[PDB]
């Protein structure tokens, strides 16, 4: 089929994450934390990127448009029900949290509950289950 | 030549070499010629009725394993068709003859019960041949890019020649050997 390209990159340094060039671009974007298969699919469609390509096949500009979509799903018309941070506590702004910011938001959301002595925050602090599951026989 | 397997393969020119294994492979008699390896037959009410069941169907039924493939006989028939086409491609012969040769060159003839070495009956011989053939094909296909139809074709082709590159023939050899060591 398609033979190759001299520009084919095996590892592409993307959003402080390594993306395999031997992977289809849609599933290749799921390497960055905060981006799943469905959000990567939406990002690929809205950036006008061929879904039958491989990550290494794309050029610099194509990944730049992918990052334009990933860092601002809203300007590219990605609805607000499609975001992993809907209606933020402090901000109130809808946004798509990606990369290390996901871990940062996790830690801040847990610290908020660990200062107000909320039950769920204390469950997090004790290393036990937080979503009301039985702990007698499972989770060992 | 009115009845052909898949309406693509003739029954008349199938030679079942072994006289011992002749009444327990249902290929030669015109009563055992079928268009499809699918009959929904009641070949289990009596002790020796599965012998009068077409041999391609007996090969097909052993593909419905394991539990994740249980009851999926249309997919098994599809595997049989795609295997019989690869056999015809790689041997240029009638796939039914390759299959009967593989089932003949795979059934162990002697075994060790209790450790006295005993001889296998023709029915258990064909049962063991089919079980080893499909087991080897399935284990070849597991976690492998190669399709179950291609693995079945390769296993059947290597068992028809008699080569020790077929899991069934290697295993037949071990079985009969332990009945030579423990004679």
């Amino acid at each position: 089929s398609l033979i190759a390209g001299e520009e084919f990159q095996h590892i592409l340094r993307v959003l402080n994450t390594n993306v395999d060039g031997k992977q289809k671009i849609m599933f290749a974007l799921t390497s960055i934390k905060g981006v799943g298969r469905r959000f990567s699919n939406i990002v690929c469609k809205k950036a006008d990127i061929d879904m039958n390509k491989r990550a290494g096949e794309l050029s610099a500009e194509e990944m730049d448009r992918l990052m334009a979509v990933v860092h601002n799903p809203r300007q590219f018309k990605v609805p607000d029900w499609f975001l992993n941070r809907k209606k933020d506590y402090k901000d109130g702004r809808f946004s798509q949290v990606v990369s290390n910011a996901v871990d940062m938001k996790l830690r801040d959301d847990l610290e908020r509950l660990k200062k107000i002595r909320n039950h769920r925050g204390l469950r997090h602090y004790w290393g036990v289950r937080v979503r009301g599951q039985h702990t007698k026989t499972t989770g060992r | 030549g009115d009845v052909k397997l898949f309406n693509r393969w003739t029954f008349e020119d199938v030679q079942v070499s072994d006289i011992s294994l002749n009444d327990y492979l249902a290929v030669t008699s015109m009563k055992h010629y079928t268009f499809l390896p699918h009959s929904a037959g009641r070949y289990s009410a009596k002790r020796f009725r599965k012998a009068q069941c077409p041999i391609i169907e007996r090969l097909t039924n052993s593909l419905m394993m394991h539990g994740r493939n249980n009851g999926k006989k249309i997919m098994a028939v599809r595997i049989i068709k795609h295997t019989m086409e690869i056999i015809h491609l790689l041997t240029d012969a009638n796939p039914i003859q390759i299959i009967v040769d593989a089932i003949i060159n795979s059934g162990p003839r002697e075994d060790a019960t209790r450790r006295q070495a005993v001889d296998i009956s023709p029915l258990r011989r064909v049962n063991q041949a089919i079980y080893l053939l499909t087991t080897g094909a399935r284990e070849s296909a597991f976690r492998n890019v190669k399709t179950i139809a291609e693995c079945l074709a390769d296993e059947l082709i290597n068992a028809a020649k008699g080569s020790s590159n077929s899991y069934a023939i290697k295993k037949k050899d071990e079985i009969e050997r332990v009945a030579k060591a423990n004679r």
Binding site: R37, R38, N41, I42, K45, K46, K77, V78, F82 | -
Partner: protein, 140 residues
Amino acid sequence: STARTVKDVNPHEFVKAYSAHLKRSGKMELPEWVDIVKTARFKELPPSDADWYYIRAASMARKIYLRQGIGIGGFQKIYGGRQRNGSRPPHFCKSSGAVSRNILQELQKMGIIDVDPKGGRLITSQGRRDLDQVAGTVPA
């Protein structure tokens, strides 16, 4: 040859021919949420075929041709399937009603299918003619 109606042709080929017919006709207006939505909630990815809207339009057009009175809930049941519930047993689930309603309204804005007083949707004479005249072009 010709003189073949819908119940004479292989459905897999008829749907493919009629989706192309609908896309050529240019009388279908696509929603904004064509590249976003999933056909059902048990689905985990949007349809992988760009012309899935026209394919589903042809499918429902053929279904209304063969049966009269199908409603939006009926079409949700028709295109619903098995939902995998993670560690829980699978069950049946229904499809999206917005997609079915929008496509059926688009097919009312072509005079292919109307709505019957008895409930649901009927095939129009023009729609019957269109499907039957496309069925004759389907190679046997």
